[PDB]
């Protein structure tokens with residue numbers, strides 16, 4: 035009614051031990067919306083291109099169970115500087131994540147967190 | 150400004166089928182009442198309606214109701230074009246579809262209740278996609294025209310078949326089409342938008358014009374700006390209100406595709422662009438898709454860059470397609486892309502200005518429910534460095550403060566929120582003020598200190614201020630002011646503070662260097678020190694250079710470097726040099742020639758009256774009682790410099806301060822005055838002091854003075 039879109043991406047950053055994934059656990063335990071958990075290195079797959087498809091499938095799994103929350107633990111594992119990345123698959127994964135985040139406005143009911 | 154252009158006006162008795170035009174403009178267009186005409190507005194939205202006339206209508210205005218206003222995606226005061234729409238045939242079969250929430254809870258037959266009476270013998274002209282509102286039933290229901298036969302323009306005759314079975318239209322789709330994004334939405338870049346439109350639409354609209362002059366249109370347009378300016382928004386707006394087909398390519402979307410599938414996508418984009426000419430290709434974030442070919446760790450990126458190069462070179466401009474790019478780092482784009490023939494024109498999208506950011510805030514906040522108190526102009530002023538993305542984030546933060554203010558009355562655990570709260574909820578100026586609070590945008594010495602030498606100070610203004618005081622007179626009358634002045638005499642005239650005062654009077658920084666500091670006991674370091682000092686003076690212009698113990702500088706090539714750089718410094722006219730010498734005989738004449746040090750000013754020991762002036766200055770710096778006589782102190786300081794007299798004042802101040810503190814501490818301790826000085830302390834400081842400069846030094850300086858009377862004939 036007031037006319038402002040919800041915040042689509044929240045980044046939790048801090049020194050080790052502060053309680054970021056503890057916040058994630060608390061939210062996953064006491065939120066109403068369906069909770070999807072993503073661990074960065076878990077995205078990797080041996081088959082050609084299956085890791086980007088894993089990120090994609092996670093996002094559409096959030097789509098079907100809307101509203102949803104996606105938690106991407108250890109975001110720096112899969113989101114380094116593409117100017118400094120020497121690997122093709124990692125660069126494709128970062129770009130795929132960027133495309134998903136840009137479409138997250140199209141989603142209209144999904145919120146993603148990262149620690 | 151054209152007769153076809155008509156300013157939007159309110160309708161009085163015009164329904165969805167009729168529009169009113171003034172009689173003089175009705176004759177000007179050679180139009181007749183009852184004719185069918187084509188209506189064009191923003192965002193390439195058209196309509197067809199019956200044309201009528203109203204004598205109460207202003208000439209420059211056109212009458213059409215709110216529904217027709219919506220169908221043209223405009224508001225009151227906007228500009229639309231009017232043209233005849235000949236050969237609109239009678240309808241055979243047209244399909245209309247309702248809106249979901251407008252029909253929710255309605256279970257009757259849509260046709261009989263709404264459509265047939267509203268289309269009964271009306272001969273209503275309707276174009277595909279038009280939205281029309283029909284009264285009746287329990288509540289007014291909106292409908293969407295999805296299909297007509299013939300298309301797009303048709304007349305609903307009595308024999309026209311009307312059917313509405315199918316799927317209703319959602320509110321989200323209609324809302325997205327309604328708000329969407331136009332040229333008016335982008336604010337603060339009207340110059341850049343005008344340049345873009347004239348650069349891109351003219352080859353699309355008039356390729357023949359470029360053919361006649363014989364000049365090929367620009368092939369590619371490159372957008373470079375800091376992140377947040379709105380290049381993607383400009384791309385979307387161009388995608389909207391251009392007749393040519395628009396194909397959008399995202400750099401991340403192409404990178405995310407597997408190797409060889411990005412190649413196929415680029416090929417298919419160019420093929421579709423040439424197939425449906427005229428066309429536009431946009432590659433957003435060109436830096437993402439095209440890294441520097443010299444420095445790229447992946448072969449796939451180089452392949453994609455080279456494929457883009459070949460495809461853009463292969464464009465023959467007969468299809469007249471324009472490729473368009475946007476970036477955050479223009480230098481990150483490959484040099485081959487920026488060369489002539491590829492992305493030849495580059496458009497800079499800078500940070501919006503105050504009026505521009507006020508415009509941006511207008512569009513951002515016009516969706517938002519607003520109170521009367523909040524003023525957008527003050528917020529725009531307080532956002533000096535905020536770019537449009539920061540403005541949107543600031544709007545969100547202000548809304549969030551409104552939410553927090555209404556948070557206490559509401560409950561999070563509730564499944565629904567109360568209506569009285571939301572109609573009570575409103576954003577004020579204070580919310581924007583808090584958002585602004587959190588938001589983050591992306592000499593000393595004077596002339597009074599030195600007592601005396603007022604004429605010397607006037608000479609100093611003649612030296613320094615006159616070029617600024619009257620530059621026009623200097624321009625008319627050949628004049629290069631002296632850049633160097635020598636102060637010769639005892640170290641008792643305050644020339645050090647005269648330099649600071651002359652620098653301060655023009656608010657120019659002042660540099661002071663001691664004589665032995667220049668030496669370095671190295672073969673070329675000492676000379677390089679002088680050159681570095683002269684460079685500092687040149688770059689820190691306007692400035693004044695002071696060389697304490699300048700004579701001590703003067704086998705020895707350092708002085709010769711000084712002459713060299715003093716010759717060189719003549720190019721810059723606002724740098725000044727002042728010289729201090731302890732003995733005048735030692736300094737070489739080559740230092741004191743005109744062009745290096747042409748003004749010789751004698752610095753005399755302070756006068757007794759000048760000593761009283763120094764005493765007044767010291768009374769200003771430190772409170773002093775009137776029991777002591779300033780004349781007596783000045784008399785007793787004949788052989789003492791101004792510095793030693795000031796030190797006498799300082800010591801007297803110390804003694805009197807000690808006396809006052811001791812008396813007040815004695816009073817405070819017995820419980821458990823005169824910071825102004827007495828004559829006793831002044832006598833103490835007089836007898837403590839020793840002479841600064843003997844008579845012999847004054848004899849030397851006087852002899853130097855004597856080493857330094859005309860009437861023209863007839």
Ligand SMILES: Nc1ncnc2c1ncn2[C@@H]1O[C@H](COP(=O)(O)OP(=O)(O)OP(=O)(O)O)[C@@H](O)[C@H]1O
Pocket residue numbers: 048049050051052053054055056057149
């Ligand atoms: N603010 C806090 N309140 C209560 N317990 C906390 C808090 N912060 C951390 N802890 C506890 O300390 C430990 C911190 O581990 P945890 O992995 O949650 O921290 P983190 O900073 O999010 O981790 P990492 O930096 O490795 O991602 C856990 O046992 C957690 O329960």
Ligand SMILES: Nc1ncnc2c1ncn2[C@@H]1O[C@H](COP(=O)(O)OP(=O)(O)OP(=O)(O)O)[C@@H](O)[C@H]1O
Pocket residue numbers: 334335336337338375376377378379380381382383475476477501509512536537538541
């Ligand atoms: N001049 C403007 N007028 C209206 N809205 C603007 C303006 N500038 C920015 N915005 C708003 O700020 C946001 C800009 O997002 P957008 O992705 O288009 O920016 P950008 O600078 O082109 O992006 P990027 O850095 O990814 O190239 C949008 O919400 C847009 O509505």
Ligand SMILES: Nc1ncnc2c1ncn2[C@@H]1O[C@H](COP(=O)(O)OP(=O)(O)O)[C@@H](O)[C@H]1O
Pocket residue numbers: 598599600601639640641642643644645646752753754755756759763790791792793795
């Ligand atoms: N003739 C003078 N008249 C007024 N003040 C002086 C005079 N000579 C020195 N002073 C004061 O004494 C302080 C030290 O001066 P000093 O550097 O010894 O003079 P000089 O530049 O002749 O060596 C300065 O702050 C200056 O204000």
Ligand SMILES: [Mg+2]
Pocket residue numbers: 054055056107149
């Ligand atoms: Mg953790």
Ligand SMILES: [Mg+2]
Pocket residue numbers: 379380381382
């Ligand atoms: Mg952008």
